Design a binder for this molecule. Structure first.
Ligand SMILES: [Zn+2]
Ligand SMILES: [Zn+2]
Lengths: 215, 217
């Protein structure tokens, strides 16, 4: 029946500025609209209920406004802690409930170059027949980064995968793992394994490398 | 301080029925104050309310699911359950149990359980292998958690005492169909030696539990 429409879907703002999230109703809501904040991997937290009354413990920086078809969630000054996905939620004096698609709030901050580390496959892993070489990029910004694997000076393709953490909640940075997957036979085939990292905060691409069997 | 916790199979074969149970603490499911409901969240997606139940046995359902949802409450055990029939790949999601205040005030999921991830798949459960990523001012070390199914794994460091600088990456699905992730932490180069670092890997779908000590090499 009644549907919720949240705008926008994603949002990026600098620390301290004011951000506005809009949730639109199919009909004259008048029941109630509630707002939740959800951090990745955790259950959502109720920020505001009955449109404008703030849940308890919630910072004064959050505010809710609106009635009828249009409602608003407003953050006076963004904090790094505010990185989350925000959901409006509709209900009457009884179920059913309805949620908005959600608004992801990312944080704009100073450019931060990554720290790069390289891990050869453990000896424990090489005994299972597999060799994973891991390159770690720590606490960098912005999220856009390029990692290149070269094995014995030859650029590889298709045998590496990467995954990135959500935006950090205290310092607003990202971290990245790049994993080159090899078989034990092919890992013992080469000597030099190098990880090349390209990022806006880096004057030049940085390379971390190791020779297999040197320590 | 009502507390809710769900227990589920985690893995359900397609076409089969998902059975979840939420255990409630601090308040009784018999109370007239609460609506006991289930909310699911597909991996990268938003929240979808499944259904809720009052103590008289009064059942509310989603219009999209009504067909397949069955919710019941057990007062003797102070639990309530979820029954989803004919599971589809679209049903793969994290399933929350939550309560909501019925009389005192307006409806709003006060208190949630932790998530339980349900993956609809025919593949079998497989526990992870845990390999140390040894360290060489700031050093990095970690654990490679490889070749497990299905999601999720929990990684803690030093029984939870080590949280600062911990980054446990989202798992990637490998060519083989198994999941793999790395958990890393940045620590001072001074530690290495004076400090012990143990990653604790828990894979509930396989009830596998590995502690691996990470020593400098
Ligand atoms: Zn409470
Ligand atoms: Zn870090």
């Amino acid at each position: 029946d009644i549907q919720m429409t949240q705008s926008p879907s994603s949002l990026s703002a600098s620390v301290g500025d004011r951000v506005t999230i809009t949730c639109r109703a199919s009909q004259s809501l008048s029941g109630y609209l509630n707002w939740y904040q959800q951090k990745p991997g955790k259950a959502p937290k109720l920020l505001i209920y009955a449109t404008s009354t703030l849940q308890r413990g919630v910072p004064s920086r959050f505010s809710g406004s609106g009635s009828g078809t249009d409602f608003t969630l407003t953050i006076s000054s963004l904090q790094p802690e505010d990185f989350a996905i925000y959901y409006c939620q509709q209900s009457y004096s009884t179920p059913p409930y309805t949620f908005g698609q959600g608004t992801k709030v990312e944080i704009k901050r100073t450019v931060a170059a990554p720290s790069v580390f390289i891990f050869p496959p453990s000896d424990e892993q090489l005994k299972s027949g597999t060799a994973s070489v891991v390159c770690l990029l720590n606490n960098f910004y912005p999220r856009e980064a390029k990692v290149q694997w070269k094995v014995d000076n030859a650029l590889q393709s298709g045998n590496s995968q990467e995954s990135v953490t959500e935006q950090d909640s205290k310092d607003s940075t990202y971290s990245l793992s790049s994993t080159l997957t090899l078989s034990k036979a092919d890992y013992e085939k080469h000597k030099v394994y190098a990880c090349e990292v390209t990022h806006q905060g880096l004057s030049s691409p940085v390379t971390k490398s190791f020779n297999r069997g040197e320590c | 301080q009502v507390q809710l916790q769900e227990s589920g199979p985690g893995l359900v074969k397609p076409s089969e029925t998902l059975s979840l149970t939420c255990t409630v603490s601090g308040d009784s499911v018999s109370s007239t104050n609460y609506y006991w409901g289930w909310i699911r969240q597909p991996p990268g997606k938003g929240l979808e309310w499944i259904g809720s139940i009052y103590y008289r046995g009064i059942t509310y359902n989603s219009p999209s699911l009504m067909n397949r949802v069955t919710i019941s409450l057990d007062t003797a055990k102070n639990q309530f359950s979820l029954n989803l029939s004919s599971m589809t790949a679209a049903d793969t999601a994290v399933y929350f149990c939550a309560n909501s205040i019925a009389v005192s005030g307006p409806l709003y999921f006060h208190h949630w359980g932790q998530g339980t991830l349900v993956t609809v798949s025919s593949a079998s459960t497989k526990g992870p292998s845990v390999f140390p990523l040894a360290p060489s001012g700031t050093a990095a070390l970690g654990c490679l958690v490889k070749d497990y199914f299905p999601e999720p794994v929990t990684v803690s460091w030093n029984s939870g005492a080590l949280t600062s600088g911990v980054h446990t990456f989202p798992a990637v699905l490998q060519s083989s169909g198994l999941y793999s992730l790395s958990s890393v932490v940045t620590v001072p180069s001074s530690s290495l030696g004076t400090q012990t670092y143990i990653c604790n890997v828990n894979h509930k779908p396989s009830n596998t539990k590995v502690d691996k000590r990470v020593e400098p090499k």
